[PDB]
Design a binder for these strands. Structure first.
Lengths: 74, 74
DNA sequence: CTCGGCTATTAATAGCCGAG
DNA sequence: CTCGGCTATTAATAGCCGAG
């Protein structure tokens, strides 16, 4: 918001990591907000380079493993 | 934007489906925008009650299957 | 009884200054 | 040479009117 952003990686390594940290926690926030508004089935996984695994799923990812595996099947 | 929204399911079945369609395509839009700004590892899966499967992954979900399976391992 | 097409406004995002 | 804490503004979201 403080400025109009362009969809491009920030050459500033210091700022580049700053925009991702904002969206990282800022995105998972949406998986929760979008889930409460429609309680839809979603699967969000992130692997920040700072070593941080986060898994959020309003429909129990237990299915995503078998279910997604079914779409991957011919 | 046309109004301040509250994090709650819309009792209006007609509008309830409307907010989800906006976020559904509107969210996957972010997996692409957040991916271009930091090219991070993300896994987005959605199952709309209207029967529509969408899979987006900037880090090839091929790993999410084995990688996520490693965190699920004791 | 219902729906789509086109549009306005708030939150969340990206940022900047001071100190060591 | 580097970082964090606290804050302002634009896009994307949620919506509303007319017609059958």
């Amino acid at each position: 918001g403080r400025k109009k952003i362009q969809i491009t990686r920030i050459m500033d390594e210091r700022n580049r990591q700053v925009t991702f940290t904002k969206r990282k926690f800022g995105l998972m926030k949406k998986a929760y907000e979008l889930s409460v508004l429609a309680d839809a089935e979603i699967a969000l996984i992130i692997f920040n380079s700072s070593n941080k695994l986060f898994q959020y799923a309003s429909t129990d990812m237990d299915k995503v493993l078998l279910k997604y595996t079914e779409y991957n099947e011919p």
